[PDB]
Amino acid sequence: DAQDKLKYLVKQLERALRELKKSLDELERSLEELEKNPSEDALVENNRLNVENNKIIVEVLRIILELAKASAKL
Amino acid sequence: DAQDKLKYLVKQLERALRELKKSLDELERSLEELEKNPSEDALVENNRLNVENNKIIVEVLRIILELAKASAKL
Amino acid sequence: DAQDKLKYLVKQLERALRELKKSLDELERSLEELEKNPSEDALVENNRLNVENNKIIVEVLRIILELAKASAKL
Ligand SMILES: N[C@]12C[C@H]3C[C@H](C[C@H](C3)C1)C2
Ligand code: NA
């Protein structure tokens, strides 16, 4: 089962990275707006999106730990 | 030795992810306070915690590089 | 070819982590300046560097997905 589960975990990783990429693009657009017209409001929104992006990174790292455990059987 | 070292590196990864999770929870609480009562002070604290969270992510990635090197022997 | 490609991907990972580390050091220095003399300008620069650091993390994760695919052949 170990090889087949690895393949599934790799597909989960690809899905999560797609989600991370879309988040990163939103974050960068936020930073461009902030650099153009800085304000408290823009700053909070920018931070919100940075936090969200870190949260998704942690989810991606969780999947990599599951990949590492699956490997460390075989 | 390669298989046994891999198992140890996997335990190190699990420990570091526990630390990252606790950090993420602190960061999210900071963002909730910031969104409630935005101020310069809240903003700096929020950034401090975001930076700290990135620093731990880099430590987690270091461990994954060590896992990748251990794998690439066998 | 799978073993040799893995070795190459591991070297790519080491290069990218060197780049991430240098970024992290810049980000931390930014945060020290911000904590010393907080201002809107310092805040935007700090966020800029945090965003940049997340962007490099995503590139590092891309390489780890390529390492996971290379493994999941063998
Ligand atoms: N074999 C591994 C490939 C990839 C990098 C590292 C951790 C995970 C994901 C398993 C080694
Ligand atoms: Na920020």
- One DSSP character per residue, chain C reads -HHHHHHHHHHHHHHHHHHHHHHHHHHHHHHHHHHHS--HHHHHHHHHHHHHHHHHHHHHHHHHHHHHHHHTT-
Calculate helix-pair angle for B40-71, C40-71, nearest 10 degrees.
20
Distance between CA atoms of C3 and B65, rounded to whole angstroms? Answer: 16
For residue B30, the number of C-alpha atoms closer than 13 Å in the C-beta half-sphere is 26
Distance between CA atoms of C16 and C53, rounded to whole angstroms? Answer: 12
Comparing CA positions, the residue from C8, A57, C7, A56 lying closest to residue B60 is A57
Question: Which of B17, B24, B60 has the CB atom closest to A55's CB atom?
Answer: B24
For residue C21, the number of C-alpha atoms closer than 13 Å in the C-beta half-sphere is 10
Comparing CA positions, the residue from C54, C36, A6, C16 lying closest to residue B64 is C16
Measuring from atom 3 of ligand 1, which residue has the nearest CA? C68
Distance between CA atoms of C42 and C56, rounded to whole angstroms? Answer: 21
DSSP state for residue A74 in the 8-state scheme:
-
Comparing CA positions, the residue from A60, A12, A58, A47 lying closest to residue B48 is A47
Distance between CA atoms of B31 and A29, rounded to whole angstroms? Answer: 20
What domain range is B8 assigned to? 2-71
For residue C66, the number of C-alpha atoms closer than 13 Å in the C-beta half-sphere is 16
Whole-number Å distance, alpha carbon C55 to ligand 1 midpoint, is 21
**A34 in Cβ contact with C47 (< 8 Å):** yes
The SS3 assignment for A4 reads: helix
**Model resolution, angstroms:** 1.9
Q: Which residues of C20-59 are buried (b: 16+ CB within 10 A; e: fewer)?
A: beebbeebbebbeebeeebeeebbbebbbbbbebbebbbe
Binding site membership of C10 for ligand 1 (Cβ less than 6 Å) = no
Contact between A24 and C54 using a beta-carbon 8 Å cutoff:
yes
Binding site membership of B68 for ligand 1 (Cβ less than 6 Å) = yes
Q: How many domains does chain A have?
A: 1
Count of C-beta atoms within a 10 Å radius of residue C17: 18
Distance between CA atoms of C62 and B20, rounded to whole angstroms? Answer: 20
